[PDB]
Design a protein around this ligand. Structure first.
Ligand code: ANP
Ligand code: ADX
Ligand code: MG
Length: 173
């Protein structure tokens, strides 16, 4: 089986990473293309349950995810990784792990403004952060460094279904 590839999705909480990743996975599977989603939040309940949201713990979370992604890619899967990845150094590290493993790596920036993410607020975390009930929350009191040159920038200009089709177009180009 030919080696797979990784699509790494960075962005604020509530920017649409997980939604887009899951729809891409569905669209690919339906077409007989093996895809799998390694979602930062879901994996923080198992593999990464020992980690919090300190910058050191986020780096570790993302290091681990990058190695798990290369291994599933080596197996032939198209791997989708929705994780905030707030620091440039976090994306650089993931990119390096992939380079070292000889797996193609695509960076997708879900560029939804903070105001819109907050206006969405699907898990109530922004409201908690602003009330001081959660600390070190990305975009509020923990940094997000915007990617300078992502392979694809998704904006809230179209449906999730269309955004998923743009990721597929990127892969198929
Ligand atoms: N293109 C879009 N059009 C309309 N709504 C959208 C779009 N993209 C995302 N959303 C909405 O934004 C909400 C947050 O999406 P989600 O995919 O959970 O974000 P995330 O980046 O994975 N968040 P987090 O897990 O906190 O890092 C979803 O409930 C979507 O309904
Ligand atoms: N302090 C926090 N900062 C950011 N996201 C948080 C925080 N606490 C809980 N979360 C939730 O945890 C998930 C972010 O986890 P990751 O994507 O794994 O983060 S990362 O920074 O290490 O890349 C999101 O689904 C988010 O809703
Ligand atoms: Mg998510």
């Amino acid at each position: 089986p030919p080696r797979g590839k990784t699509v790494w999705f960075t962005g604020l909480s509530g920017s649409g990473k997980s939604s887009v990743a899951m729809l891409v996975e569905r669209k690919l599977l339906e077409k007989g293309i093996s895809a799998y989603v390694l979602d930062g939040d879901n994996l923080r309940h198992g593999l990464n349950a020992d980690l919090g949201f300190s910058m050191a713990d986020r780096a570790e979370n993302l290091r681990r995810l990058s190695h798990v992604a290369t291994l599933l890619a080596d197996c032939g899967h198209l791997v989708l990784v929705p994780a905030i990845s707030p620091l440039a150094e976090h994306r650089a590290l993931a990119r390096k792990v992939h380079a070292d493993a000889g797996i193609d790596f695509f960076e997708v920036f879900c560029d939804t403004p903070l105001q819109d993410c907050e206006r969405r607020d699907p898990k109530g975390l922004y409201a908690k952060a602003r009330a001081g009930e959660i600390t070190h929350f990305t975009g509020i009191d923990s940094p997000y460094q915007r990617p300078k040159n992502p392979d694809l920038r998704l904006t809230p200009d179209r449906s999730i279904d269309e955004q998923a089709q743009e990721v597929i177009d990127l892969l198929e180009s």
